[PDB]
Ligand binder design. Structure first.
Ligand SMILES: [Mg+2]
Ligand SMILES: [Mg+2]
Ligand code: NA
Lengths: 806, 553
């Protein structure tokens, strides 16, 4: 009995939204607006905008209009544009994917063979990804129902070019006035006082050759042995090897003010990741008629080592990847590399018992060890008992009818968290000579020309503290007590459940930064405090059929939980980190709760300013912050609890429809009544809320309160944030309630009597779409409310596909 | 199976117990000198040019006021917040210096002098570094933490408090270190990176000076001038010590700011920026990364104020115009000028750092702001563009050494303490002033042709060794310091020492508002703005142990 399973998928992917930025036109508006608002002359701007403007009879300023020269440039080398910079670096995406699998199974042995291909032209320009894979599984019965040895194997090859770090984000604060290409059709960029930021599209080109290649083998071999009846121990060993190589080309560039001084260079990177596992597991089980058991005992070792190293060379005579290998360099060089590793051991065991399919029970104990910790606390033991009671099966609730199943579970299960830095426990000193790039300085290098020779050779090096160690660190423990009800009603058409969890985490591991006097390297993995997390979930569905063969199944979900911090080292509550922004200790509050000032709108009147408490940079048009002191000054004590990321509740619903061979299925997820806090509003609502001047800004600051536009919530435009508008305020909290069609999928299934005509069994086409539409609240300023720190949404997928199945 | 989780060890690492081993100890010493070249940032130079834009010497610079917006607030004295990232930064960073000095002392202290016959010499070096840090920390904040117990365990740091000592008692602890350094440094260092004995002296003095203008009250106003403090400033500036180390004034002022004369006889102690040295792009002075002229394409910060350009004007008697300098802007062809200008301020119509194939103009190529912040360039931290010592990484940087103590500082400080003593040694203080002034007089190397080719009329004359009133001798002392240290970040600090911070800065705020428009809504709050606030992040994280600065609560 051989089975063949073929699959295929094209998928298109598009951005459907983004934070609207300034036109080259609007930009000139806003800059002028900020200039006149601040009462300084908007024709002494450094960007070359020409304004003609005047007063609107009430005596207020009005813009009449705007002329730029043809070139941004004293020498006509760079021309003004209206670059839609996000559109220049964006593409539609297309995914192609195929998967072929053959499966022979004998009553002696069996074997599987897969072969897949995936190729993903990305939604960014000059970035792709593809991936071949082949699976080869098999097993062999060497004695009839007594002894068997098996294997599992998978092989992958992968090739990508990647977007640099946040180009999209760099693509939205580059002014649209900057032209992609310059006059000669070279690459274009800033000039003069225009903000110092490199043409995203240029970057994407210069980076189109930085491609890596990655391989992966993983799988296991096992022998399963079964002496006499109902008992079988088995051992398995498995491995996982991976390797990543790439060359990273630096080419030169002069793009206006954006120079590189002609530096060329390549870095060849290599990375290896090697993991292996061996276990052994005995499993007896009994069943004397009415009485059932499962006992299980085993142990499993794991070890991971990984390492990475790098060769970097400067100065090439031919700016291509054929010539630009390190051997061909003619300038200075650098080498880099290191490795880390860890290992884990696990002894364990399982209990399983039942009566006449009625009163059940299971126990589990396990002892876990980890390389990460000192010898002091290296192990720790996690017990876990759960029991259940299928109650319709009881010999008295039998009449009942209408209901067909009703169980009643209850868990109490400890569990361990170990995932931290492999070097958690050491005061680490490293000999940072200074061989490595760094933005702005801050090398943190141990080298120094002690002789005063300006150098010309190797320099005295040293060591430097990267961390402080705690040899008292230990595991983290989550005690999760569970309780619920499985149920199923009217002729198995009404089903659902009803749980109540209560997780409780103890000795939570984070890495704490240091107090500032402690100085460099003060930073260490501590266990700090505990936290509670208990809620209620509810699932319920109805499925049925109709006369006109319509089968449907609506399954819904409603979730709700609360979360509280129970205890924090004084130093750790005092510094924020879990909330309270270092004004208010977060104990007895929700994990991630924040604290800031509360914003009472805009001053619309010198009187509003005057009979308001003293505020530093308050004037008409600035944000009015309230006096929770009620003491007449605003200082810094005037701030309470303004953010709380716990949802009020969360809900989901799945839909399945079947009719006349068709196959429809939708998936809706949502959350009601959450808060959200973001930064994006420093880019959409102020000229002057960031460290670098003149970057491109959002689109709703055009709606800024002004004489000529009162009754606006967005504060006025100014050249220098003097009301400290960008303090932590309710301004930056919005409602992120939402509802999101996730996936929706239609499918046609060729009827079986004519699929066989061309020799098949299951032939089905389908169309799907992920991330289709969202529904936000009117109080949200936009771009996917469940990731509010992004000025762009997740891109939409649309997929055509078919699943053949001879 | 426990023989399994011990098999792996850290790679490329010294763990903590081993760092104490002595083979690593000259590594630790050097690592502490290093950070001074490798631990600053574009926005947070350890030269503190950033936070001297408050002074009447310089404008922020850059595109406009929306660019580095938090330094514009400082420049004008409005909008400064106890949470501004830049201040919390300079704090965190200068205490990062200290970690290295104390890590080194925590092993130096545990050596064997018989084995290490340089123990006391290299303890003086580390303590001297630790001084240098606290001093700048005291200048910028006043109410600092004193971290000077090298054996202090990590958790002892949570209970540290910045109030533990008083104002005089904090200055005294900053003295206690340089005093040790003086009593244990050699009279010459064959490696110029290490301070010589005279270097620990000058600092020792400078520390006593700032300690002499006592602010022994609750607010930042003067509470009296201590003469025992001033007697100490006259002590450790004695020329008999400075001869013992070979120090003195250069033949020509410009020599202190040219790569061709690093480590001359005026460089009492300097940071050793270097290139071609194994580092990714050089141990360059990346702190002046913003203050490179716009001709290189970025970023035109640290622009010199007209108020400074004018203060070089002199009458026909070769003296400053003490009460008339700012009335009319410096006019090249009529005014007698002090030569020191053309080494401090690069002016339009003139060569940028002597290279007369780069003449400064009034155009996009020389002002990132279209004239908002002016058309002047700071010359001291910048160099010839044709230098083989200027590279471009993220910003443009050189290997030009940054001097911490010029011997002129020694002379003027000595004159200052003398004048303020009024023990008849006013004449001696004048004679010291004349050493520095008569030097600047002849300094027409590199600019001699300027007379004919640009019509500049040099004329500087020393003062007559007669009697002078203590208020009169201070007047001239202050002026020499103004012209001698243009754009060297001492200026704001000098007025706060003198206690005339509010009076001078506000007066600069009105005169200059007709010439720079960012200075229109400006104003120095007295008893508040003498010192930055203590960073909220820090006060917040001290769980009650830290006290804010006066007038910030
Ligand atoms: Mg208040
Ligand atoms: Mg140097
Ligand atoms: Na100023």
């Amino acid at each position: 009995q051989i089975k063949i399973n073929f699959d295929a998928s094209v998928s298109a992917s598009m951005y459907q939204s983004k934070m609207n930025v300034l036109n080259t036109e609007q930009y000139g508006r806003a800059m002028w607006q900020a200039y006149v608002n601040d009462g300084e002359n908007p024709n002494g701007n450094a960007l070359g905008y020409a304004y003609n403007w005047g007063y609107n009879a009430d005596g207020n300023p009005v813009l009449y209009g705007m002329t730029l020269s043809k070139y941004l440039d004293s020498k006509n080398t760079m021309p003004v544009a209206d670059t839609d910079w996000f559109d220049e670096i964006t593409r539609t995406g297309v995914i192609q994917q195929y998967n072929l699998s053959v499966s022979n199974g004998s009553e002696k042995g069996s074997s599987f063979f897969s072969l897949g291909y995936y190729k993903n032209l990305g939604v960014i320009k000059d970035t792709d990804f593809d991936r071949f894979s082949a699976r080869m599984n098999s097993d062999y019965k060497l004695i009839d129902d007594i002894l068997t040895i098996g294997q599992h194997f998978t092989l992958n090859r992968t090739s990508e070019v990647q977007a640099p770090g946040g180009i999209i984000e760099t693509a939205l604060d580059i002014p649209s006035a900057i032209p992609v290409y310059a006059s000669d059709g070279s690459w274009g960029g800033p000039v003069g006082g225009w903000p110092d930021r490199r043409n995203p599209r240029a970057v994407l080109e210069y980076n189109k050759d930085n491609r890596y290649t990655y391989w992966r083998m993983f799988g296991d071999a096992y022998v399963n042995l079964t002496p006499f009846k109902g008992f079988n121990l088995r051992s398995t060993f498995g491995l996982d090897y991976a390797n990543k190589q790439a060359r990273y080309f630096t080419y030169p560039y002069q793009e206006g003010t954006q120079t590189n001084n002609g530096k060329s260079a390549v870095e060849a990177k290599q990375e290896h990741w090697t993991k292996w596992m061996w276990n052994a597991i005995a499993t007896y089980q009994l069943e004397v008629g009415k009485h059932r058991g499962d006992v299980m005992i085993g142990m499993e070792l794991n070890r991971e080592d990984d390492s990475h190293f790098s060769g970097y060379k400067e100065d090439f005579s031919i700016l291509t990847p054929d010539y630009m290998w390190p051997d061909a360099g003619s300038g200075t060089a650098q080498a880099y590399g290191a490795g880390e590793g860890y290992s884990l051991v696990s002894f364990f065991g399982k209990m399983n018992y039942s009566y006449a399919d009625r009163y059940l029970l299971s126990l589990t104990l396990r002892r876990d060890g980890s390389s990460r910790f000192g010898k002091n606390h290296r192990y720790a033991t996690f017990p876990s008992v759960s029991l259940g009671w299928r109650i319709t099966q009881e010999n008295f609730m039998k009449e009942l009818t209408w209901l067909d199943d009703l169980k009643l579970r209850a868990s109490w299960g400890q569990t361990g968290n170990q995932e931290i830095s492999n070097l958690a426990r050491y005061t680490i000193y490293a000999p940072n000579y200074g061989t490595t790039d760094s933005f702005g300085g801050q090398s943190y290098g141990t080298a120094y020309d002690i002789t005063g020779s300006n150098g010309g050779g190797v320099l005295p090096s040293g060591f430097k503290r990267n961390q402080i160690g705690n040899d008292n660190i230990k595991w983290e423990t989550t005690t999760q007590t569970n309780v619920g009800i499985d149920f199923s009603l009217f002729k198995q058409s009404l089903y659902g459940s009803l749980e109540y969890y209560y997780k409780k985490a103890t000795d939570i591991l984070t890495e704490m930064a240091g107090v500032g006097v402690l100085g460099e390297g003060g930073s260490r993995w501590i266990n700090s405090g505990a936290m509670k997390n208990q809620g209620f979930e509810f699932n319920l569905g109805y499925r049925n059929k109709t006369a006109f063969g319509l089968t449907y199944d609506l399954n819904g979900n409603i979730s709700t939980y609360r979360n509280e911090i129970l205890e924090l080292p004084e130093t750790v509550a005092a510094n924020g980190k879990f909330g309270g922004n270092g004004v208010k200790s977060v104990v007895g509050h929700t994990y991630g709760a924040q604290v800031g000032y509360i914003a009472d709108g805009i001053f619309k009147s010198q009187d509003e300013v005057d009979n308001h408490a003293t505020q530093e940079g308050a004037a008409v048009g600035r944000i009015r912050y309230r006096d929770i002191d009620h003491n007449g000054v605003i200082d810094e004590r005037d701030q309470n609890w303004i953010y709380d990321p716990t949802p009020s509740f969360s809900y989901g619903l799945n839909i399945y429809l079947e009719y006349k061979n068709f196959d429809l299925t939708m998936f809706w997820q949502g959350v009601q009544g959450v808060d959200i806090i973001s930064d994006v509003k420093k880019k959409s609502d102020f000229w002057s809320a960031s460290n670098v001047g003149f970057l491109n800004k959002g689109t709703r600051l055009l709606n800024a309160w002004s004489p000529t536009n009162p009754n606006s919530d967005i504060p006025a435009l100014t050249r220098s944030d003097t009301n400290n508008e960008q303090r932590v305020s309710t301004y930056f909290v919005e409602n992120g309630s939402f509802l999101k069609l996730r996936n929706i999928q239609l499918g046609y299934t060729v009827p079986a009597v004519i699929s066989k005509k061309m020799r098949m069994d299951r032939l089905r086409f389908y169309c799907s779409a992920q991330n289709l539409l969202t529904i936000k609240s009117k109080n949200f300023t936009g771009e996917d409310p469940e990731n509010p720190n992004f000025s762009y949404p997740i891109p939409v997928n649309i997929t055509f596909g078919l699943n053949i199945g001879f | 199976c426990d023989d399994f989780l011990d098999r792996q060890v850290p790679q490329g690492i010294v763990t903590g117990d081993q760092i104490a081993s002595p083979e690593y100890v000259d590594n630790l010493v050097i690592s502490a000198y290093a950070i001074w070249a490798t631990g600053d940032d574009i926005n947070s130079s350890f030269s503190l040019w950033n936070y001297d834009v408050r002074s009447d010497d310089c404008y922020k610079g850059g595109s406009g006021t929306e660019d580095g917006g938090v330094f514009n607030a400082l420049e004008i004295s409005k909008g400064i917040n106890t949470t501004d990232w830049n201040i919390n930064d300079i704090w965190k960073r200068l205490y990062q210096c200290i970690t290295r000095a104390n890590t080194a002392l925590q092993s130096l202290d545990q050596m064997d002098e018989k084995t290490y016959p340089l123990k006391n010499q290299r303890i003086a070096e580390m303590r001297f570094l630790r001084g240098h840090a606290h001093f700048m920390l005291k200048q910028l904040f006043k109410k600092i933490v004193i971290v000077n117990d090298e054996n202090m365990e990590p958790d002892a740091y949570n209970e540290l408090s910045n109030t533990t000592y008083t104002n005089d008692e904090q200055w005294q602890k900053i003295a206690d270190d340089f005093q040790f350094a003086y009593d244990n440094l050699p009279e010459v260092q064959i490696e110029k990176g290490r301070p010589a004995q005279a270097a620990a002296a000058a600092y020792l003095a400078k520390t006593y000076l700032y300690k002499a203008y006592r602010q022994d009250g609750a607010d930042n106003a003067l509470t009296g001038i201590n003469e025992e403090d001033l007697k100490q400033v006259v002590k450790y500036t004695d020329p008999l010590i400075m001869a013992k180390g070979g120090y003195g004034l250069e033949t020509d002022y410009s020599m202190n700011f040219l790569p061709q004369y690093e480590n001359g006889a005026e460089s009492v102690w300097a940071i050793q920026y270097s290139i071609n040295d194994g580092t990714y792009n050089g141990n360059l002075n990346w702190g002046m990364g913003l203050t490179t002229p716009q001709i290189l394409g970025c970023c035109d910060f640290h622009k010199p104020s007209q108020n400074l350009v004018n203060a070089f004007k002199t009458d026909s008697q070769g003296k400053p115009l003490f009460s008339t300098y700012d009335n009319e802007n410096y006019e090249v062809a009529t005014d007698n000028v002090d030569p020191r200008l053309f080494h401090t301020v690069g002016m339009p119509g003139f060569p940028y750092k002597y290279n007369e194939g780069y003449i400064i103009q009034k155009n996009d190529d020389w002002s990132r702001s279209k004239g908002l912040y002016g058309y002047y360039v700071s010359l001291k931290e910048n160099v010839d563009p044709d230098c083989d010592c200027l590279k471009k990484g993220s910003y443009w940087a050189s290997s030009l050494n940054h001097i911490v103590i010029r011997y002129a500082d020694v002379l003027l400080m000595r004159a200052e303490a003398l004048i303020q003593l009024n023990d008849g040694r006013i004449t001696d203080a004048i004679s010291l002033i004349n050493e520095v002034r008569s030097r600047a007089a002849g300094s027409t190397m590199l600019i001699f042709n300027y007379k004919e080719d640009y019509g500049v009329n040099f004329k500087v004359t020393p003062y007559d060794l007669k009697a002078y009133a203590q208020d009169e001798a201070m007047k001239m002392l202050k002026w020499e310091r103004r012209v001698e240290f243009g754009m060297e970040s001492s200026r704001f600090f000098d007025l706060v020492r003198w206690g005339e911070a509010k009076d001078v800065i506000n007066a600069y705020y009105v005169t200059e508002a007709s010439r720079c428009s960012i200075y229109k809504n400006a104003g120095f709050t007295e008893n508040k703005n003498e010192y930055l606030p203590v960073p909220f992040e820090q006060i917040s994280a001290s769980n009650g142990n830290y006290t804010q600065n006066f007038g910030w609560h």
